[PDB]
Design a protein around this ligand. Structure first.
Ligand SMILES: Nc1ncnc2c1ncn2[C@H]1C[C@H](O)[C@@H](COP(=O)(O)OP(=O)(O)OP(=O)(O)O)O1
Ligand SMILES: Cc1cn([C@H]2C[C@H](O)[C@@H](COP(=O)(O)OP(=O)(O)OP(=O)(O)O)O2)c(=O)[nH]c1=O
Ligand SMILES: Cc1cn([C@H]2C[C@H](O)[C@@H](COP(=O)(O)OP(=O)(O)OP(=O)(O)O)O2)c(=O)[nH]c1=O
Ligand SMILES: [Mg+2]
Ligand SMILES: [Mg+2]
Lengths: 715, 737
């Protein structure tokens, strides 16, 4: 009897490690929610659930689990792509009666005029390549649904995005289709949510100079934020030009209440417009309201600092910092580095300061905020501007929400970003050699994609659109760096890892540029190209004084770029990639495993998950048991103190806490020479003291990092 | 013992010189109850040796005012002492003070900051001659201590602490500020202000003849529409107007309901409540020591009304509160009919049910029904339920104000423009607003007790002439005001509305010796307001001749010879020939769509010494805080002191009685009659009187209701009464106790 269930679980067991997967186990839990009443479709989830719990015994359960629920999706959705599309278009909302197409006619009509070539391109066996928690992610949000029931299979949705990008160009579409569905990279969420629809808001982040220091200013800027958040976008906002508390107002002959009351207005605007807000506010440490600033998360806004070098210099030489009001001392954010230290001091040597503190004391109020709340983020204004390819445009006033994007912004330019990410774990061949020829190749495609995205994209406000058209900046990231190192057999901190880290990024960048060049050959450079460091032969690694390894002939590439230029002001920026890395079963971005154990909620409750790579070594060596697992939870996810585990692995699966943050910082410093934008650097300090922190910032600062620190994590 | 004189010159104490100086300022005062040796005695104890001769003026004017409780003359005397001080501390010649104020260099910020406009100076200056000798400083001695200290606290200009302006220099600046090179009229206005016949609204008082003049107090807005973009555009406007110290009232009914579908995002609308948080947050943050004030107007067919209703509570949950906005209801006739006949009432989304707010009266009644019929409703409730909800809101908070859309639109001369979607912060202004037009209003009030004579007869003929003047002034303001936003300016030049108000109405009855509630008082109330409407139309007519109609005149009720009182079916008394005027208009047209708008004269009433607006006394005994002082109704005290009926315990037995004189066995009834508090008076009678005067007020009236012990019965009956009277504003605040 339960035999009829088992022999059916078994069907989807192909290629799985049957030392550790045992279908009999599931059946024993499933056969009990059985009765004369419901049957198969119900029991289908039942088993998927059960299987999914069992992930703790073996990673293959996640995959088995996945497969079952997938089988069941297929058993309840249309096969033919064009036919699924047809339904999404037609959907009359039978609620009111008005027609509401879920895809866009043009994408429909493109799809139908090639129903032949697109339909038979889709390989639906590719829906089994996702793990459970990955699949469930898609099913919650990424797969389009008519009234309850999901319509799109994951292939459908990929094909949709693909043609949603390459429109009339089928070839480019089917090659993007493949790449994606084999999980060689991914687009940003907005792209996957929106490509092929009526509101194709694909970009994924915006930046924003505060238009002007008046009510009129503050409220136009506010109108804009509301508008971007409407159509999804995250925002960075440059706020430093707003006059401080006490600063006189001529028009009303009153006295301004300063930056904070104004940050309340914005906060409140984020609680409103949603589809929760998310603004990063960037303040410069010379602003007279910087102290109140540091108490605010100490609320729907994240604070970040636009640090000028001068400030770091003064802090380390126990010194005199002078807080100014931007009304009283104009243009202080319109300038960086040299011209800043001249202009700033000029105001100091002119008396015109509102209040002097010791540099060191401000510093320590920062360390206080970070230990409390994990914020403010630390970004170095001078580093960012010095190594920016957009420096010919002016002074770069701030960054995006996750500190990775560094772009110019003005009264009439609001910077945007279009992002995507390469799955580094996919390029390590089954020989523990890393395939770079293939990595470069895929980047070049991602560039063409992102580049196409600029023109088709829906822009929420006009100067988002004006910005992006002038400088055509893109942003390309990575995920699974950690899994790459593990699949290679490399302790994250090993010299072996440390080289690979450079090499990977020498490659991503080589390809990006090379592809950006071919596009410039094809359609000319972006119009604010000539004037920039690349018209001058100075690529990103030069600005760092790094000479790359002989892996690629940059000699040859520079001669190309000298001939036809590039298409995009900027290209690379490794980002958090939180939501996508969940689908692909990867560790987020460039960071180690925070723990070797963690959970994940899925509708009702959670599932307990051990590091997939890890569990596979412990079980094969027959070291996996009850209390074995129960102990690692006791050690917050480390295995260092568990006695019967080899030397080999204790090294291989060190958690981020057990890793040297100095080393982490140094490694970013390395790769960051081939990242033309910035990177989202979290810092993990187990037991913090103000000492450890202070050298951290200082170490990373000395390394010359564009972003010093995204989040500080403490416990 | 000695006193330091006005020059550092030690002078021994000589207490007769105090009494002597006081006596010098008792011209015209009834000396039988004003013993000025009483102050002397009370001064020379609160008095150490070496104290400044200037402090023996403050200490003395302070003492003098705490004796209002003996004879109101004392309160006038207390001022006289403070003014006889100020004059000594001030430059006499007007044109000199104007020089200082301009040439004033900011002693902190080394740069320069005029306090008058260059033009205002260059006029005053090139007109030194006439203007200087025009001013009568013997008018500064005609206020009482309380009016005076309000003036002193914000209405005269301070050069670095030191009050530069004398009250006449102020009055004068304002006149030139309105009249520029028109020196004949500046002087005529100065005379009518300084003789206390009327007062301009505070924003005019403040800014008149300064640079970038914010002369107007009130602004009306309609939301820009169901959009994140509309919302934030209307918010920038509100911010911009609030920075210019302007009061605001807003039409918010078009906004999607909590739940309503949002196309572009597939998500769903969070409703009015969340948006109103954003409006509170902005009101808090933009200013004018004073936070901006928005009145929010909702129509009772909107799905979010119940939430709208608990938002003013100080009891509930932090997330759904907004104690900084003021809530109002724009009420269709239908809702009221539905209530008194226990029928159901449907709540809609303006998204699934467009056009509701852009249409009134039967046009509405038709459109609303055909939605109900169509099943276009999100929730359907018993009408009485909503009405119960409304009246506990009022019981707990005193809000929402109660406006009747159908009255306002039916009886408005802006009718030819479209639907009037809301009123203002104070509910007396009834003007049109659109995507392109924010209605400003410019206001002033007449001191209604100035026009009653020694022989207890009223001077309507004079009241009509003063009104004419005001209209000419309020008109010029429109052309000199600096508009916070362009749509404000658009509107005002298009329809040139003006709102003329009143203060000292209850004072007017008392001088004649009328109870508020008599046939006498109730005839005069009609007659007075006829007079104001008559005089004002006649003024606007003259201007039309001089200049042309207001652009949007043609097709209006007036351009058809329909005057406000026509819209009520009320024949005026025979006091004035309304057919002569009607003939005069159909000739030249008028210059201002709207004219009369009885607003609540909050602080200009404190100055002129008058009782607020259209209202009877709240008490015969009260407080004004400046030490806070113990004023007895000046009128009452006179009749008591005259009839030799005033002492310590009587003053007290009234405080015992919450300022009522009713129970006191020693007072003639015809006095107990005249001096009833508002908590004695019939509110129905109040509502009838407004309605009765309402036929002559082309806008509305801020109208509080006082009900002592309030229940559902009393609150309900009171609204419905006024409603059936044809009132546009049926209730401003509900005050209780
Ligand atoms: N010798 C005195 N003894 C008591 N009170 C005095 C004396 N001199 C003046 N005062 C009081 C009377 C008034 O209430 C108050 C202000 O009167 P005022 O005559 O303006 O002061 P003053 O005498 O210092 O100046 P002035 O030089 O103009 O006379 O001072
Ligand atoms: C008027 C006003 C301004 N502000 C703020 C907003 C701005 O940051 C700052 C003044 O900017 P503005 O609003 O532009 O004031 P202004 O142009 O009339 O005066 P000035 O030219 O001297 O700057 O103060 C308030 O917080 N509350 C207010 O009521
Ligand atoms: C987009 C968005 C709209 N809204 C509300 C506010 C507005 O009253 C209402 C109108 O939506 P809009 O802001 O105009 O968005 P839309 O253009 O998609 O609207 P429409 O469906 O008419 O095309 O939606 C939010 O509260 N939060 C949001 O994030
Ligand atoms: Mg300004
Ligand atoms: Mg819309």
């Amino acid at each position: 009897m339960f035999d009829k269930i088992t022999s059916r679980i078994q069907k989807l067991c192909y290629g799985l490690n049957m030392d550790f997967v045992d279908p009999a186990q599931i059946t024993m839990k499933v056969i009990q929610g059985l009765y004369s009443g419901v049957t198969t479709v119900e029991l289908d989830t039942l088993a998927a659930e059960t299987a999914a719990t069992l992930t703790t015994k073996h990673p293959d359960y996640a995959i088995l689990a996945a497969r079952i629920a997938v089988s069941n999706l297929h058993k309840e959705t249309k096969k033919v792509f064009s036919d699924v599309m047809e339904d999404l278009y037609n959907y009359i909302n039978p609620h009111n009666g008005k027609h509401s197409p879920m895809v866009a006619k043009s994408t429909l009509d493109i799809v139908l005029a090639n129903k032949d070539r697109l339909n038979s391109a889709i390989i639906y066996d590719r829906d089994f390549s996702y793990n459970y928690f990955g699949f469930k992610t898609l099913e919650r949000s990424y797969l389009l649904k008519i009234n309850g029931k999901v319509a799109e299979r994951p292939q459908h949705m990929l094909m949709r995005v693909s043609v949603g990008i390459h429109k009339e160009d089928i070839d480019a579409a089917i090659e993007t289709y493949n790449l994606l569905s084999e999980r060689w990279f991914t687009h940003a969420s907005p792209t996957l949510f929106n490509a092929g629809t009526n509101r194709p808001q694909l970009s994924s982040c915006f930046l924003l100079s505060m238009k002007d220091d008046s009510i009129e200013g503050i409220y136009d800027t506010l109108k804009q934020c509301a508008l971007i958040s409407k159509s999804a976008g995250g925002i960075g906002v440059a706020v430093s030009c707003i006059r401080a508390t006490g600063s006189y107002i001529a028009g009303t002959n009153g006295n301004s209440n300063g930056l904070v009351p104004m940050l309340r207005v914005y906060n409140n605007t984020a609680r409103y417009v949603d589809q929760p807000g998310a603004f990063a506010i960037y303040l410069e440490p010379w602003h007279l309201d910087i102290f109140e600033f540091l108490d605010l998360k100490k609320r729907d806004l994240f604070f970040a600092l636009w640090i000028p070098d001068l400030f770091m210099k003064r802090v380390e030489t126990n010194q005199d910092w002078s807080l100014m009001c931007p009304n009283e001392c104009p243009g202080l954010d319109e300038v960086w580095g040299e011209e800043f230290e001249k202009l700033y001091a000029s105001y100091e040597k002119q008396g015109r300061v509102r209040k002097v503190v010791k540099a060191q004391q401000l510093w320590y109020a920062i360390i206080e905020s970070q230990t409390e709340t994990g914020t403010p983020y630390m970004l170095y204004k001078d580093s960012c501007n010095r190594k920016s390819n957009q420096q010919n445009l002016g002074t770069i006033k701030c960054s995006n929400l996750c500190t990775e994007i560094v772009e110019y912004t003005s009264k009439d330019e609001v910077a945007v970003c279009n992002l995507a990410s390469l799955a580094l774990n996919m390029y390590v061949t089954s020989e523990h050699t890393y395939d770079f020829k293939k990595l470069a190749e895929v980047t070049k495609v991602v560039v063409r994609n992102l580049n196409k995205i600029i023109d088709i994209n829906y822009y929420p406000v006009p100067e988002a659109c004006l910005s992006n058209k002038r400088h055509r900046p893109i942003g390309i990231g990575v995920q699974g760096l950690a899994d790459a190192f593990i699949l290679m057999r490399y302790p994250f901190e090993s010299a072996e890892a440390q080289l690979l880290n450079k090499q990977i990024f020498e490659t991503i960048y080589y390809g990006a540029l090379e592809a950006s060049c071919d596009l410039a050959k094809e359609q000319g450079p972006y119009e604010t190209y000539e004037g920039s460091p690349v018209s001058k032969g100075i690529l990103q690694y030069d600005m760092w004084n790094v000479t790359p390894t002989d892996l690629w002939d940059w000699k040859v590439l520079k001669e190309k770029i000298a001939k036809y230029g590039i298409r995009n002001s900027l290209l690379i920026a490794p980002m958090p990639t939180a939501s996508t890395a969940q689908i692909l079963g990867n560790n987020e971005s460039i960071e180690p495993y925070t723990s070797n154990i963690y959970t994940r909620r899925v509708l009702s409750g959670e599932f307990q998950i051990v590091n997939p790579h890890l569990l596979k070594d412990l079980t094969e060596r027959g070291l996996w048991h009850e209390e074995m697992k129960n102990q690692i939870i006791a050690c917050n996810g480390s295995i260092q103190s568990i006695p019967e585990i080899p030397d080999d692995l204790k090294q291989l699966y060190k958690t981020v806490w057990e890793i040297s943050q100095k080393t982490v910082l140094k490694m970013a410093a390395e790769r960051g020479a081939f990242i033309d934008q910035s990177q989202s650097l979290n810092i993990h300090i187990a037991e913090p003291n103000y000492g450890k922190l202070t050298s951290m910032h200082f170490y990373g600062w000395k390394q010359g990092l564009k972003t010093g620190m995204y989040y500080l994590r403490t416990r």
